[PDB]
Amino acid sequence: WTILHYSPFKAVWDWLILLLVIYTAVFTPYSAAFLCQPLAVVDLIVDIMFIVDILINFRTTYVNANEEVVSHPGRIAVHYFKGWFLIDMVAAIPFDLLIGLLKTARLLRLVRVARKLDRYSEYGAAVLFLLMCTFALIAHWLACIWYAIGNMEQPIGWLHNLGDQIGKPYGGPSIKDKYVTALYFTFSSLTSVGFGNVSPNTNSEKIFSICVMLIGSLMYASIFGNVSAIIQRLYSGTARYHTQMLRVREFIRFHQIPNPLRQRLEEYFQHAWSYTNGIDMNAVLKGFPECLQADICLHLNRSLLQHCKPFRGATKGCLRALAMKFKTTHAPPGDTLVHAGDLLTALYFISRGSIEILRGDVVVAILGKNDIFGEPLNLYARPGKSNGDVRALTYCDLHKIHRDDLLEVLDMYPEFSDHFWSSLEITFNLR
Amino acid sequence: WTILHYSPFKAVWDWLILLLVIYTAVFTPYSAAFLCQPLAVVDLIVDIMFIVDILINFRTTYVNANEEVVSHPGRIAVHYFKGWFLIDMVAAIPFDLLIGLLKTARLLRLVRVARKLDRYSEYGAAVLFLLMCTFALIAHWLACIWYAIGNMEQPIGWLHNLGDQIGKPYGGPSIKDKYVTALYFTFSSLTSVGFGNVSPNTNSEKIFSICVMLIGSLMYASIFGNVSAIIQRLYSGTARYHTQMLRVREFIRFHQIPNPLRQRLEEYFQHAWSYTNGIDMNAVLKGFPECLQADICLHLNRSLLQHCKPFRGATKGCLRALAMKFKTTHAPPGDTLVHAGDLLTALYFISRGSIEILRGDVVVAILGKNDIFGEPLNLYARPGKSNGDVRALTYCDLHKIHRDDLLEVLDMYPEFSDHFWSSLEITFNLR
Amino acid sequence: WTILHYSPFKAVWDWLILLLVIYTAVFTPYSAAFLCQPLAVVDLIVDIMFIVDILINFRTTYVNANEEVVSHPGRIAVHYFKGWFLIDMVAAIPFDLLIGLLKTARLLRLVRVARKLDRYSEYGAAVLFLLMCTFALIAHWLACIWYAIGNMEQPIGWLHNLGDQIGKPYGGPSIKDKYVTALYFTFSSLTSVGFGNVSPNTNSEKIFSICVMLIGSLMYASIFGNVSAIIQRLYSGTARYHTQMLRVREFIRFHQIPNPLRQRLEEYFQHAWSYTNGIDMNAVLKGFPECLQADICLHLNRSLLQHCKPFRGATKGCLRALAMKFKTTHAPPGDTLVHAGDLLTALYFISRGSIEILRGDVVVAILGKNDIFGEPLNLYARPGKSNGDVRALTYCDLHKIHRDDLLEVLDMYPEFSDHFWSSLEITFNLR
Amino acid sequence: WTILHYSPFKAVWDWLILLLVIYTAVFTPYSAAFLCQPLAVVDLIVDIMFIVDILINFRTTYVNANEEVVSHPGRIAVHYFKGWFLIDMVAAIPFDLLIGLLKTARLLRLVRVARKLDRYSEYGAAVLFLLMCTFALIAHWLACIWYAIGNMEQPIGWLHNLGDQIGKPYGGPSIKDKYVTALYFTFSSLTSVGFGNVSPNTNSEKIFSICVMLIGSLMYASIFGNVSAIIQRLYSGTARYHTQMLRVREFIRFHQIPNPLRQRLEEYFQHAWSYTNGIDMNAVLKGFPECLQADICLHLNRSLLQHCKPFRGATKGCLRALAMKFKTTHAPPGDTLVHAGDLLTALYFISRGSIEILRGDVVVAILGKNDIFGEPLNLYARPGKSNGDVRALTYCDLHKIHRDDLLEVLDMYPEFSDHFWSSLEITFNLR
Phi, psi of C107 (to 5 degrees): -60, -45
Residue C391 pairs with which residues in a beta bridge? C356
Q: Residue B208: in which H helix or E strand, if any?
A: helix B203-254
CA B22 to chain centroid: 28
Closest to A91 in 3D by CA, of A34, A142, A25, A135: A25
**D130: number of CA atoms within 13 Å, CB side?**
17
CB D375, CB D386: distance < 8 Å: yes
Distances (CA, A) of B29 to A413, B47, B430: 93, 17, 88
CB C352, CB C303: distance < 8 Å: yes
**C-alpha–C-alpha distance, residues B39 and B265, integer Å:** 75
Find all residues with CB under 8 Å of A192, minimum gap 6, and list them.
Answer: A213, A216, A217, A220, B191, B192, B193, B194, C192, C194, D192
Q: Which of C203, C276, C317 sits opposite A341 (nearest CB)?
A: C317
**Which chain A positions have a beta carbon within 8 Å of B261's beta carbon?**
295-296, 299
Find all residues with CB under 8 Å of C182, minimum gap 6, and list them.
Answer: C143, C144, C146, C147, C150
Q: Residue A416: in which H helix or E strand, if any?
A: helix A414-422
CB D256, CB B298: distance < 8 Å: no
SS3 (DSSP) at C159: helix
Contact (CB<8Å) C231/D217: no
Tell me the residue length of chain B: 431
- What's the CA dihedral at D28, D33, D39, D41 to 10 degrees? 70
**C-alpha–C-alpha distance, residues C317 and C294, integer Å:** 9
CB C192, CB C216: distance < 8 Å: yes
> Which residue blocks in B34-80 are alpha helix, DSSP H?
39-59, 73-80
**C-alpha–C-alpha distance, residues C351 and C306, integer Å:** 12
D118 CB near a chain C CB, below 8 Å? no
Phi, psi of D428 (to 5 degrees): -155, 105
Edge-to-edge strand order for the sheet containing C348-353? C330-331, C396-400, C348-353
How many CB atoms are located within 10 Å of the residue C401 CB? 16
SS3 (DSSP) at A124: helix
Size of interface A-C (CB pairs under 8 A): 123
Q: Where are the beta strands (DSSP E) in B119-232?
A: none
Phi, psi of B53 (to 5 degrees): -65, -40
**C-alpha–C-alpha distance, residues A241 and B198, integer Å:** 53
- What's the CA dihedral at A126, A128, A132, A137 to 10 degrees? 70
Distance from CA of B103 to the nearest CA of C (A): 39
DSSP at D310: G
**C-alpha–C-alpha distance, residues D312 and A103, integer Å:** 88
Taking CA B403 as the corner, what is the angle to CA B401 and CA B405, rounded to the nearest 5 degrees? 75
SS3 (DSSP) at D237: helix
**Which chain D positions have a beta carbon within 8 Å of A192's beta carbon?**
192
CB C390, CB C334: distance < 8 Å: no
Paired sense of beta strands D348-353 and C396-400, if any: unpaired
With both helix axes pointing from N to C terminus, report the angle between B39-59 and B8-33 in degrees, rounded to the nearest 10: 150
Find all residues with CB under 8 Å of D146, minimum gap 6, and list them.
Answer: D182, D185, D186, D205, D208
Residue A349 pairs with which residues in a beta bridge? A399
Q: Which of C192, C196, C228 sits opposite B192 (nearest CB)?
A: C192
Distance from CA of D173 to the nearest CA of C (A): 22
Phi, psi of D340 (to 5 degrees): -75, 155
Contact (CB<8Å) B225/D223: no
DSSP at B356: E
DSSP at D327: B
CB B87, CB B112: distance < 8 Å: yes
Distances (CA, A) of A339 to A391, C288, D73, D214: 9, 19, 56, 64
What is the CATH T-level fold of the domain D288-422, as seen in this structure? Jelly Rolls (2.60.120)
Q: Residue C398: in which H helix or E strand, if any?
A: strand C396-400
| Neighbors of chain C with 3 or more C-beta pairs under 8 Å | A, B, D
Interface-testing mutation among A161, A202, A206, A320, with chain B (most B C-beta atoms within 10 A): A206
Contact (CB<8Å) A225/B239: no
CB A334, CB A372: distance < 8 Å: no
| Neighbors of chain B with 3 or more C-beta pairs under 8 Å | A, C, D
**C-alpha–C-alpha distance, residues B341 and B384, integer Å:** 5
Edge-to-edge strand order for the sheet containing D330-331? D330-331, D396-400, D348-353
**Segments of chain B assigned to CATH 2.60.120.10:** 290-422
SS3 (DSSP) at D8: helix
**D338: number of CA atoms within 13 Å, CB side?**
20
CA A375 to chain centroid: 49
DSSP at B307: T
B101 CB near a chain C CB, below 8 Å? no
Q: Would you call A187 exposed, middle or buried from its count of C-beta atoms within 10 A (0-12, 13-18, 19+)? A: buried
CB A232, CB C229: distance < 8 Å: yes
Helices then strands, counting H and E runs in chain A, come out as: 16, 6
For D317, the closest chain C residue by CA position comes to C342
Identity of the residue numbered B110? L
A residues 409..428 contacting B (CB < 8 A): 412-413
What is the resolution of the experimental data for this entry, in Å?
Answer: 3.9
Closest to D160 in 3D by CA, of D176, D178, D175, D143: D178
**C-alpha–C-alpha distance, residues D69 and D63, integer Å:** 6
Find all residues with CB under 8 Å of D306, minimum gap 6, and list them.
Answer: D312
Closest to B400 in 3D by CA, of B299, B326, B297: B326
Distances (CA, A) of D228 to A77, A91, A398, B27: 50, 43, 50, 34
C283 CB near a chain D CB, below 8 Å? no
The answer regarding whether domain B290-422 maps to CATH 2.60.120.10 reads yes
Contact (CB<8Å) D279/C247: yes
Contact (CB<8Å) B299/D258: yes
**C-alpha–C-alpha distance, residues C424 and C418, integer Å:** 10
B241 CB near a chain D CB, below 8 Å? no
How many CB atoms are located within 10 Å of the residue A86 CB? 12
CB A157, CB A201: distance < 8 Å: yes
Dihedral sign from CA coordinates of C229, C231, C232, C233: positive
Phi, psi of D408 (to 5 degrees): -75, -35
Phi, psi of A168 (to 5 degrees): -165, 70
What is the CATH T-level fold of the domain C293-422, as seen in this structure? Jelly Rolls (2.60.120)
C197 CB near a chain B CB, below 8 Å? no
Residue A350 pairs with which residues in a beta bridge? A398
**C-alpha–C-alpha distance, residues A394 and A367, integer Å:** 11
Distance from CA of D168 to the nearest CA of A (A): 26
Q: Which of D207, D236, D412 sits opposite C180 (nearest CB)?
A: D207
Distance from CA of B133 to the nearest CA of D (A): 20
User: SS3 for A249-278, per residue?
Assistant: HHHHHHCCCCHHHHHHHHHHHHHHHHHCCC
**Which chain C positions have a beta carbon within 8 Å of A129's beta carbon?**
none
CB D284, CB C248: distance < 8 Å: yes
Q: Would you call C169 exposed, middle or buried from its count of C-beta atoms within 10 A (0-12, 13-18, 19+)? A: exposed
Distance from CA of C385 to the nearest CA of D (A): 10
CB C166, CB D192: distance < 8 Å: no
CB C365, CB C393: distance < 8 Å: no
SS3 (DSSP) at C155: coil
List own/partner pairs for D309-313 with CB under 8 A and 24 or more apart: D309/D423, D309/D425, D310/D416, D310/D419, D310/D420, D310/D422, D310/D423, D310/D424, D311/D420, D313/D416, D313/D419
CB C386, CB C344: distance < 8 Å: yes
The answer regarding whether domain A123-279 maps to CATH 1.10.287.70 reads yes
A283 CB near a chain C CB, below 8 Å? no
DSSP at B189: T
For C180, the closest chain D residue by CA position comes to D203
Distances (CA, A) of D345 to A232, B8, B216, D424: 52, 52, 67, 18
Edge-to-edge strand order for the sheet containing C363-364? C363-364, C356-358, C390-391
Identity of the residue numbered D125? A
A residues 312..371 contacting C (CB < 8 A): 329-331, 335-342
Experimental approach? cryo-EM
- Kindly provide the b/e burial profile for residues D72-102, where b requires at least 16 CB atoms within 10 angstroms of the residue's own CB: ebeebeeebeeeebebbebbbeeeeeeeeee
With both helix axes pointing from N to C terminus, report the angle between A158-165 and A177-188 in degrees, rounded to the nearest 10: 110
Residue D358 pairs with which residues in a beta bridge? D363
Tell me the residue length of chain C: 431
Residue A399 pairs with which residues in a beta bridge? A328, A349
How many CB atoms are located within 10 Å of the residue C197 CB? 20
Closest to C341 in 3D by CA, of B411, B183, D322, D362: D322
Identity of the residue numbered D71? S
Distances (CA, A) of C390 to A58, A80, B88, C329, C336: 86, 81, 61, 15, 6
CA B242 to chain centroid: 22
SS3 (DSSP) at B339: coil
Find all residues with CB under 8 Å of A35, minimum gap 6, and list them.
Answer: none
Interface-testing mutation among A219, A233, A288, A301, with chain B (most B C-beta atoms within 10 A): A233
Find all residues with CB under 8 Å of B365, minimum gap 6, and list them.
Answer: B355, B356, B357, B371, B373, B387, B427, B428, B430
SS3 (DSSP) at D350: strand
CATH of domain D122-279: 1.10.287.70
CB B178, CB B147: distance < 8 Å: yes
Q: Residue C128: in which H helix or E strand, if any?
A: helix C124-153
Closest to A140 in 3D by CA, of A223, A34, A20: A34
Paired sense of beta strands D363-364 and D356-358, if any: antiparallel
SS3 (DSSP) at C60: strand
Find all residues with CB under 8 Å of A351, minimum gap 6, and list them.
Answer: A303, A304, A328, A370, A397, A398, A399
Find all residues with CB under 8 Å of C405, minimum gap 6, and list them.
Answer: C325
Residue A60 pairs with which residues in a beta bridge? A3
Q: Would you call A158 exposed, middle or buried from its count of C-beta atoms within 10 A (0-12, 13-18, 19+)? A: buried
**C175: number of CA atoms within 13 Å, CB side?**
5
Closest to B143 in 3D by CA, of B174, B94, B177: B177
CB D156, CB C166: distance < 8 Å: yes
**C-alpha–C-alpha distance, residues C320 and A339, integer Å:** 11
Find all residues with CB under 8 Å of B313, minimum gap 6, and list them.
Answer: B416, B419
Identity of the residue numbered C195? F
Taking CA D222 as the corner, what is the angle to CA D216 and CA D224, rounded to the nearest 5 degrees? 100
How many CB atoms are located within 10 Å of the residue D329 CB? 19
**Which chain A positions have a beta carbon within 8 Å of C277's beta carbon?**
250
**C-alpha–C-alpha distance, residues D33 and A135, integer Å:** 47
Edge-to-edge strand order for the sheet containing A327-331? A327-331, A396-400, A348-353
**C-alpha–C-alpha distance, residues D429 and D375, integer Å:** 6
Listing DSSP states for C317-367 in one string gives HHHHHHHHT-B--EE-SS-----TTS---S-EEEEEE--EEESSS-EE---
CA A282 to chain centroid: 23
**Which chain C positions have a beta carbon within 8 Å of B198's beta carbon?**
none
- Kindly provide the b/e burial profile for residues C273-309, where b requires at least 16 CB atoms within 10 angstroms of the residue's own CB: eeeeeebeeeebeebbeebbbbbbbbebbebbbeebe
CB B94, CB B49: distance < 8 Å: no
Closest to D308 in 3D by CA, of D293, D318, D297: D318
